[PDB]
Ligand binder design. Structure first.
Ligand code: CLA
Ligand code: CLA
Ligand code: CLA
Ligand code: CLA
Ligand code: CLA
Ligand code: CLA
Ligand code: CLA
Ligand SMILES: CCCCCCCCCCCCCCCC(=O)OC[C@H](COP(=O)(O)OC[C@@H](O)CO)OC(=O)CCCCCCCCCCCCCCC
Ligand SMILES: CC1=C(/C=C/C(C)=C/C=C/C(C)=C/C=C/C=C(C)/C=C/C=C(C)/C=C/C2=C(C)CCCC2(C)C)C(C)(C)CCC1
Ligand SMILES: CC1=C(C/C=C(\C)CCC[C@H](C)CCC[C@H](C)CCCC(C)C)C(=O)c2ccccc2C1=O
Ligand SMILES: CC1=C(C/C=C(\C)CCC[C@H](C)CCC[C@H](C)CCCC(C)C)C(=O)c2ccccc2C1=O
Ligand code: SF4
Ligand code: SF4
Lengths: 143, 80, 146, 140, 741, 73, 63
């Protein structure tokens, strides 16, 4: 048998249809993530990405930070996560400014309105996810 | 895009045209040499500047000269 | 060479030990073991496993200048072609991975040009040169007071 | 010929490579080469690998003109095919004919070509760059 | 009979005619020199037989005769060591006391004041100390007399003359045909049985009959001049039965399969001999017997004239799967029609084998009193590391040469080579990401430790008193090895080596081998090793895969294996050839091997080597400072280089002054390399023009026009000078340090 | 002020150090001179040059700084 | 000048400027550089001859 074939039935495109690129499992995974899920406004995509990312980002600052062996470890980790979230939001805004200029807007992500909605959703979601993981980490003895 | 010039010390021995990998050069009729032809560069926008023509010239201080200039997506040889 | 000569001669004169220079300056190993190896001891001991002192910043800048002088040799010895093919492979990698291929560059990434590479390697060489000689010439004189 | 390309020409049987055209071929510029074969045989692709060329007519899309001309050089110096045609496909489905332009190879003389870039003196008689200062023009 | 000897008779006439016609082997160089580039091209193309002739038969004959000449050189090199031990050494005085007499087999002539190099090595002898370990190698063979060394040297000279004659004979008298070389199954069977298994069998026989009784008597305290001669031990069952009480039964238990009666001299006790600090020689003889039986058994696999055996074409073509298309089909023709592919495999295997030898001979000292000879251990480890690194670079070089020259797309359609070439961007991209990840992590932990220690925050470091990175897998493997005797090696008395934990082995105060403890510094430096190996693999694999074509240059195979560039076009195509990739990867090999040998030297001086006193008080060479100082780059710089260069910079006026001279000279050569490595050809050509003007003015212009070195030659000269200077500096530094402490 | 009264024994000061990356022992180590804050010892010789040309107080240096600021403006 | 003459080259951008060469063939036609001069020293590409004009050769020795 042959499980590696030309990608999308074109033998001259620079990609291959390996069991990693074109499996049904990978299509179901990477067709249902927020950035690829069908029927999603850009704000909801940004929100769902942001909450997971904020949860993530408050992860490492609390445990490994300079004030880890301090009674104010979790607060300092939350503030560091907030600062990194603000930096990422600024990077998203300047990327949208440099990339999408003179665009028609709409529900497409590759436009000025779509990227502004995506950035707003990411920022509010990231701050919310950092706060939620702060609340769960402060009462970790419940579990 | 680079600029390619051919000077009148050409002998029409065609090696620059064969050495060209981008179809920049071609042979046009002429009357200033025994071969009756001189090289020409009508497609200098497809020049990449690799100077394979200048390696192939037999004349003392080569008649076909490539001057590196502005860079485009063709003269940089970018596939992406 | 000029600054090494001046610094070692004045280091021996200020300490009242000009005979050390007069005997050890005639051969290269005398320079290597009596100026550079001997006078680096207060510098490299700015911070160690037992603590640190006020010359820790000079030790850190000494290693900093070493690393910049070393990473100049990158651009000075390796030339464009290797890096252009590497950039092209990275371009394929970014264009053909999910999630991250939606982020698209405006300027096509290319390797540094030949003259630009020579300039960057030379600037690295020079900055590392200055930043590895200044901490030595300051901390060795500060670490001896003579 | 003219600026027409048959889109339904069969392609060489290739197993797919990681050397093909990237996103900036459906966006900016694409090239194709068409040639005529007498038998079914194996040729080396300019983007690595080996492909079987079909007996009859072939069509192959590449990303730059250098790849098409390197493939044409392979189709000449090896097994003799000398009727290849290289095109340039724009993203708005507009094709432009490039190689064998006037119908004959550039190394052979053809009456009807106009010399472009010819200079009527030797290379050592160019003007000094001082004489072109603050003018924008050059001494070429 | 398919496997047969077919040989041409008198193919090439022996004459001194092409000796006087340099450059005769190639078409271009035979027309005579016009510039001073024909000389360097003559030197570069001397061994490139593939570009001289298009016939594989003549190429194979040249290769065979050159192999014979190389073996002659190696036999002369063995004879030099045996003769210098016989006539110019203190081997007898070393035999009488192999713990206080320093080995020395090299004496200098007093002409210029260099007689100070004849140091006091002990035993009433003056000479240069030897770190080769040939003395312990001779003691492991029972060569207690100085006549046997002389006759071994004479036999080596005779064998070298034999190889010279064979090399002349097989190229000028009896040159085999192409069908002789392509019998790879016959060659494989004959090598596996007759070379390896019969060498193991004969060496085990020599060990059992000579080295076991002589070394047993030597460890018993008998002086070497009252030990029976090896011919008196070979045919004396009474004396061997006095030593090993199993020769009374003779060869009868061997044929009756009662091999348990031979357990007196064929053991599996393991560990180290307490008298000598080395492996038990009975274990060595038993090991060679097991290897001999295994290799002779393995040499019966491949098909020859008789119907039994395997065909290697059928084995390869049966191995194919879904994800790999046609599998290994066509590799048999590749490896039976190309010599460069066989180099690309054999050089990789030989380099990896040399590295394995380096890792195995330090933790398992195989020669008596070689563990307490620290300079010998350090020199052997560093030597085999450098040899392995050079060979593993050469493997990639010849893989690139095969890919440029001998590759054929019609032969290798849809097989493993084709599939690898069809997705090379994915391989190079993922290996690039791995290199960046490993580099950022492994080096940034060092830089973070530097910053924390410089900022006065030792509690924030990556150390054992801080955030810990314990190599738990390596410790688990060590604990598994320590508990192996009895549990998973039930018929074993001691562990395989004491580096995995156990008991300290001491020979007359000095430490032979003690357990090596792994901490966070060991984790950090092992990750450094993995990262350096990965980047070298990235450079070499990118050179091999992109040897034929790339996105930048679609017709790179038409330009050749080595070529400087393809012009300043496409933004610049500098160093696009696979040769330049090998040139760049050799630097990274140098970096990797330098870091590996630095790790070995510091860790062994800090945690293994030292002295033992009453009540087991262990005092190491540097004082156990590797655990806390190898966490920062400043710690390395201050405590390894600066602290251990004191021996090499203060060696002037003593017997080690040659090491200081070579230290300075290797620094000079390393700095001289950057002249070629940084500059370019055109400047030097214009300067040569300016010099040629003065020469022309004084009627001194050579007819062979002087030219600058070519771009590829300039890179090669710079790289060779860089490698020579670096290896010389490290060589002198290591030897002057470890001899004097 | 302190360096004028004793030039051979008082280390001249370049400026004060502000670093949130310092540990405790770095703060005590860089606290030198007559001051009580972490500080850099000047190695440019500006103290001797100003001391020769008539500067004796911090007010003189401040007025020179104002004059050069107005000149730059 | 004639065939077999020894000439000195006056072209400043030539590799053999102010160097002696031998005239090989003088073409009689519309060629701008009719005289063929062969030299004993190869240039950087390795080419021994070149085509020269009649005013770029200063003449040294008659045939
Ligand atoms: C790569 C090397 C490296 C590493 C691992 C660290 C690690 C650290 N540094 Mg550090 N540092 C480094 C180099 C490094 N340093 C260098 C080179 C310098 C000098 C310029 C410094 C200077 C420095 C200072 C001055 C300080 C630190 C500090 C710290 C600590 C906290 C930092 C933190 O939370 O960041 C934020 C971390 C994150 C946001 C995490 C991102 C990484 C995540 C885990 C990647 C996950 C990828 C994921 C697995 C992919 C798979 C996804 C898939 C499953 C879908 C931490 C132990 C602080 C300290 O006090 O230490 C105790 C501190 O004050 N660093
Ligand atoms: C005195 C005896 C003798 C004579 C007269 C010849 C004569 C010849 N041999 Mg021959 N040969 C001999 C012994 C001899 N050989 C031996 C003993 C061997 C085995 C190694 C060979 C192996 C051999 C091969 C494989 C080839 C020849 C070839 C040739 C021909 C040209 C070689 C040439 O230019 O030499 C000049 C070359 C040298 C003087 C090089 C000597 C370098 C030595 C071996 C190494 C010394 C350096 C050493 C490493 C120390 C460095 C420090 C010529 C007919 C070639 C031929 O016919 O091509 C068509 C060819 O391919 N011979
Ligand atoms: C059992 C038979 C046998 C043995 C022992 C060898 C041994 C060898 N072959 Mg060989 N070969 C054989 C059969 C054999 N071959 C057959 C059948 C073929 C044809 C298919 C080949 C084709 C072949 C080629 C094409 C090449 C070799 C090469 C080599 C050498 C490899 C280098 C090495 O390991 O150095 C080890 C060095 C030694 C062991 C030193 C001893 C050297 C002698 C000649 C070994 C034999 C001695 C003798 C038989 C034993 C006497 C015992 C006595 C004391 C009681 C090695 C000497 C290569 C080489 O180096 O060419 C010269 C090479 O290029 N062989
Ligand atoms: C190539 C290796 C080699 C060689 C040349 C010899 C040679 C010899 N062995 Mg021997 N031996 C070997 C390997 C070897 N052995 C190995 C690997 C072992 C371990 C199993 C032994 C175990 C062994 C024992 C136990 C004895 C010998 C003995 C002998 C001697 C007389 C045997 C004989 O010829 O009987 C005639 C040959 C046959 C009947 C067949 C002879 C010198 C005997 C001895 O010491 O003689 C004085 C003796 O008692 N061998
Ligand atoms: C089994 C070992 C082996 C063999 C048989 C070959 C064989 C070959 N190699 Mg190869 N190679 C090897 C190992 C080997 N190599 C290793 C280990 C490397 C990595 C460094 C390389 C890297 C390499 C490259 C990069 C190239 C070759 C090439 C070649 C071919 C021509 C070589 C030639 O004419 O050189 C003639 C021999 C010389 C010029 C002598 C070199 C002398 C060295 C540079 C100096 C040594 C200094 C010395 C050790 C110390 C001096 C001390 C000082 C104080 C005096 C030939 C087929 C070339 C080729 O075109 O292949 C087709 C080519 O481009 N090889
Ligand atoms: C000390 C000198 C030096 C340094 C630092 C490097 C660094 C590097 N070389 Mg290299 N190189 C050098 C000398 C050096 N080289 C020389 C002399 C040569 C000539 C032979 C080469 C030839 C060469 C080749 C041929 C290749 C490299 C490659 C690489 C890269 C490996 C990937 C990696 O881990 O990057 C990670 C970065 C580092 C290891 C260095 C910085 C680490 C810091 C401390 C931690 C992270 C810092 C962070 C990114 C920034 C934070 C601070 C900032 C915000 C201010 C890396 C950029 C390979 C490459 O790029 O492919 C992947 C490659 O193929 N080099
Ligand atoms: C993680 C490492 C790290 C970091 C981030 C810092 C950060 C800092 N240290 Mg520091 N330090 C460190 C490690 C570190 N240190 C270590 C290990 C030591 C040794 C103990 C010290 C010793 C030390 C001393 C002794 C001092 C500092 C000072 C400072 C501060 C300088 C800021 C400044 O003036 O900006 C200005 C920054 C620059 C001028 C550098 C940029 C140079 C660029 C490349 C030139 C080109 C710029 C270009 C035009 C682009 C700019 C765009 C423009 C629009 C801005 C800053 C807070 C100083 C301080 O207190 O300052 C108030 C000071 O006196 N540190
Ligand atoms: C480890 C993965 C493993 O060993 O896979 C090995 C797997 C085996 O492939 P096939 O089963 O097609 O190969 C059968 C024969 O070709 C091998 O003898 O090959 C690949 O999937 C290559 C992918 C490398 C992926 C690198 C990660
Ligand atoms: C050191 C050296 C040397 C020397 C060497 C030698 C001395 C060698 C020897 C060698 C030898 C001396 C070898 C031997 C071998 C033997 C063998 C290898 C045998 C075998 C046997 C067998 C195999 C048997 C079999 C059998 C059986 C068991 C059963 C059946 C029957 C029979 C009996 C057949 C020289 C001088 C060269 C050089 C330098 C180095
Ligand atoms: C490493 C290396 C590269 C690769 C280096 C590259 C591609 C540039 C690296 C840039 C660094 C990573 C900074 C990137 C810029 C930052 C993202 C900041 C952006 C600034 C803009 C917004 C202005 C070459 O291109 C090269 C070319 C010729 C000879 C030698 C070499 C060489 O050694
Ligand atoms: C110096 C230099 C030259 C000029 C080097 C030349 C012309 C080499 C000259 C070789 C000489 C003639 C060999 C013998 C050297 C001395 C005559 C002997 C010295 C002996 C010592 C051991 C004392 C290049 O051609 C070049 C090309 C490309 C990159 C870098 C460089 C480069 O750096
Ligand atoms: S190679 Fe040079 S001389 Fe020959 S035809 Fe072309 S331009 Fe003219
Ligand atoms: S520079 Fe290259 S592409 Fe341009 S004309 Fe010359 S050879 Fe052709």
């Amino acid at each position: 048998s042959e499980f590696v074939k030309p990608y999308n039935n074109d033998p001259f495109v620079g990609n291959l249809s390996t069991p990693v690129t074109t499996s049904t499992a990978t299509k179901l995974y990477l067709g249902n993530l927020p950035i690829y899920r069908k029927g999603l406004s850009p704000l909801l995509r940004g929100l769902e990405i942001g909450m997971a990312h904020g949860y993530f980002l408050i992860g490492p600052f609390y445990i490994l930070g300079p004030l880890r062996n301090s009674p104010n470890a979790l607060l300092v980790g939350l503030f560091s996560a907030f600062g990194l979230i603000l930096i990422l939001t600024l990077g998203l805004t300047i990327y949208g400014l440099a990339s999408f200029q003179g665009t028609e807007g709409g529900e497409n992500l590759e436009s000025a309105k779509g990227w502004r909605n995506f950035t707003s959703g990411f920022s509010i979601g990231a701050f919310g996810g950092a706060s939620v993981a702060y609340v769960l980490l402060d009462n970790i003895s419940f579990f | 895009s680079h600029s390619v010039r051919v000077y009148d010390t050409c002998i029409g021995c065609t090696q620059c045209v064969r050495a060209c990998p981008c179809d920049v050069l071609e042979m046009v009729p002429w009357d200033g040499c025994k071969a009756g032809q001189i090289a020409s560069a009508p497609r200098a926008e497809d020049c990449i500047g690799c100077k394979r023509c200048e390696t192939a010239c037999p004349t003392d201080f080569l008649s076909v000269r490539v001057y590196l200039g502005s860079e485009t997506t063709r003269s940089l040889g970018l596939t992406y | 060479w000029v600054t090494f000569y001046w610094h070692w001669k004045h280091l021996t004169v200020w300490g009242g030990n000009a005979a050390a220079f007069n005997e050890s300056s005639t051969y290269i190993m005398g320079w290597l073991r009596d100026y550079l190896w001997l006078n680096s001891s207060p510098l490299i001991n700015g911070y160690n496993a037992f603590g640190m002192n006020a010359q820790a910043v000079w030790a850190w800048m000494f290693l900093f200048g070493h690393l910049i002088w070393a990473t100049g040799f990158m651009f000075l010895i390796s030339w464009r072609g290797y890096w252009q093919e590497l950039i092209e492979t990275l371009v394929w990698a970014h264009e053909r991975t999910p999630i991250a291929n939606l982020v698209k560059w405006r300027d096509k990434p290319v390797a540094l040009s030949i003259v630009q590479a020579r300039l960057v390697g030379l600037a690295h060489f020079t900055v590392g040169f200055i930043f590895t000689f200044a901490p030595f010439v300051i901390a060795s004189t500060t670490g001896k007071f003579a | 010929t003219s600026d027409v390309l048959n889109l339904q020409i069969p392609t060489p049987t290739f197993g797919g490579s990681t050397g093909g055209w990237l996103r900036a071929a459906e966006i900016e510029e694409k090239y194709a080469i068409t040639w005529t074969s007498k038998k079914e045989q194996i040729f080396e692709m300019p983007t690595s690998g080996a492909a079987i060329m079909q007996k009859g007519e072939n069509l192959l899309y590449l990303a730059k003109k250098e790849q098409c001309l390197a493939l044409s050089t392979q189709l000449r110096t090896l097994f003799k095919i000398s009727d290849y045609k290289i095109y340039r496909i724009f993203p708005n489905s507009e094709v432009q004919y490039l190689h064998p332009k006037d119908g004959v190879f550039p190394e052979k003389l053809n009456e009807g070509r106009i010399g472009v870039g010819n200079v009527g003196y030797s290379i050592g008689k160019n003007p000094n760059p001082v004489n072109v200062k603050f003018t924008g023009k050059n001494t070429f | 009979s398919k496997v047969r000897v077919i040989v041409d008779k008198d193919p090439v006439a022996t004459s001194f005619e092409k000796w006087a016609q340099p450059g005769h082997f190639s078409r271009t160089l035979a027309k005579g020199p016009k510039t001073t580039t024909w000389i360097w091209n003559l030197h570069a193309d001397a061994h490139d037989f593939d570009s001289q002739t298009s016939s594989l038969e003549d190429i194979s004959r040249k290769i065979f005769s050159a192999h014979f000449g190389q073996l002659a050189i190696i036999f002369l090199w063995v004879s030099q060591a045996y003769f210098h031990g016989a006539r110019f050494s203190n081997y007898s005085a070393w035999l009488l006391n192999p713990t206080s007499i320093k080995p020395s087999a090299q004496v200098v002539w007093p002409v210029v004041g260099q007689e100070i190099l004849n140091g006091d090595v002990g035993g009433g002898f003056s000479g240069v100390q030897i770190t080769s370990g040939v003395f312990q190698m001779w003691r492991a063979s029972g060569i207690t007399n100085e006549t046997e060394l002389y006759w071994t040297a004479m036999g080596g000279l005779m064998m070298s003359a034999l190889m010279v004659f064979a090399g002349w004979f097989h190229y000028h008298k009896a040159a085999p045909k192409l069908e002789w070389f392509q019998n790879v199954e016959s060659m494989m069977n004959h090598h596996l049985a007759g070379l390896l298994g019969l060498g193991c069998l004969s060496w085990s026989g020599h060990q059992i009959h000579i080295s076991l009784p002589i070394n047993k008597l030597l460890d018993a305290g008998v002086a070497p001049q009252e030990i029976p001669l090896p011919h008196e031990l070979l045919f004396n069952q009474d004396l061997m039965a006095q030593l090993y009480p199993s020769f009374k039964k003779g060869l009868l238990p061997f044929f009756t399969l009662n091999w348990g009666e031979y357990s007196d001299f064929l053991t599996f006790k393991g560990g180290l001999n307490p008298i000598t600090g080395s492996l038990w020689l009975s274990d060595t003889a038993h090991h060679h017997l097991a290897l001999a039986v295994l290799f002779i058994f393995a040499g019966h696999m491949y098909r020859t004239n008789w119907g039994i055996g395997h065909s290697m074409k059928e084995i390869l073509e049966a191995h194919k799967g879904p994800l790999t298309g046609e599998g290994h089909k066509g590799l048999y023709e590749i490896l039976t029609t190309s010599w460069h592919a066989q180099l690309a495999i054999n050089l990789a295997m030989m380099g990896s084998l040399s590295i394995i030898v380096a890792h195995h001979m330090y933790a398992m000292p195989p020669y008596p009193y070689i563990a307490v000879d620290y300079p010998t251990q350090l020199s052997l480890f560093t030597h085999h590391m450098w040899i392995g690194g050079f060979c593993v670079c050469g493997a990639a070089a010849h893989g690139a040469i095969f890919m440029v020259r001998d590759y054929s797309p019609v032969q290798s359609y849809n097989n493993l080579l084709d599939r690898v070439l069809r997705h090379r961007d994915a391989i190079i991209s993922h290996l690039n990401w791995v290199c960046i990840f490993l580099g950022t992590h492994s080096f940034g932990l060092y830089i973070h430790n530097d910053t924390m220690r410089a900022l006065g925050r030792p509690q924030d470091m990556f150390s054992d008193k801080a955030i810990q990175l314990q190599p738990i897998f390596a410790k688990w493997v060590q604990s598994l090895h320590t508990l192996a005797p009895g549990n998973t090696a039930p018929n074993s008395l001691a562990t395989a080596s004491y580096a995995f934990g156990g008991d300290v082995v001491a020979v007359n105060g000095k430490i032979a081998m003690m357990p090596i403890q792994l901490g966070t510094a060991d984790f950090l430096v092992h990750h450094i090793h993995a990262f350096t190996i990965h980047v070298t693999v990235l450079i070499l694999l990118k050179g091999v895969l992109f040897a034929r074509s790339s996105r930048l240059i679609p017709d790179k195979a038409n330009l050749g294996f080595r070529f400087p560039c393809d012009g300043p076009g496409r933004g610049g195509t500098c160093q696009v050839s696979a040769w330049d990739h090998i040139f760049l990867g050799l630097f990274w090999m140098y970096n990797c091997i330098s870091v590996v040998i630095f790790h070995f030297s510091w860790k062994m001086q800090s945690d293994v080597w030292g002295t033992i006193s009453e009540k087991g008080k262990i005092t190491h060479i540097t004082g156990g400072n590797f655990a806390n100082s190898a966490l920062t780059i400043n710690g390395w710089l201050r405590d390894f280089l600066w602290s251990q260069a004191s021996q090499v910079i203060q060696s002037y006026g003593s017997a080690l002054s040659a090491y200081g001279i070579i230290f300075l000279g290797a620094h000079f050569i390393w700095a001289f390399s950057l002249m070629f490595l940084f500059s370019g050809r055109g400047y030097w050509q214009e300067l040569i023009e300016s010099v040629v003007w003065a020469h022309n003015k004084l009627k001194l212009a050579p007819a062979i026009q002087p030219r600058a070195l070519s771009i590829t030659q300039g890179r090669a000269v710079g790289l060779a000078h860089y490698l020579l200077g670096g290896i010389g500096t490290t060589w002198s530094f290591f030897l002057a340090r470890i001899i004097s402490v | 002020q302190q360096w004028v009264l004793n030039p051979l024994k008082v280390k001249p000061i370049a400026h004060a150090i502000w670093d949130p990356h310092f540990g405790q022992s770095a703060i005590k180590a860089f606290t030198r001179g007559g001051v009580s804050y972490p500080v850099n010892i000047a190695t440019s010789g500006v103290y001797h040059w100003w001391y020769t040309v008539g500067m004796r107080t911090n007010e003189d240096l401040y007025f020179g700084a104002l004059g050069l600021l107005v000149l730059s403006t | 000048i004639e065939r077999g003459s020894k000439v000195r080259v006056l072209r400043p951008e030539s590799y053999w400027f102010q160097e002696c060469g031998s005239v090989a063939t003088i073409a009689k036609g519309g060629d701008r550089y009719p005289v063929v001069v062969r030299f004993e020293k190869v240039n950087y590409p390795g080419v021994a001859p070149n085509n020269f004009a009649l005013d770029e050769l200063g003449e040294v020795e008659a045939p």
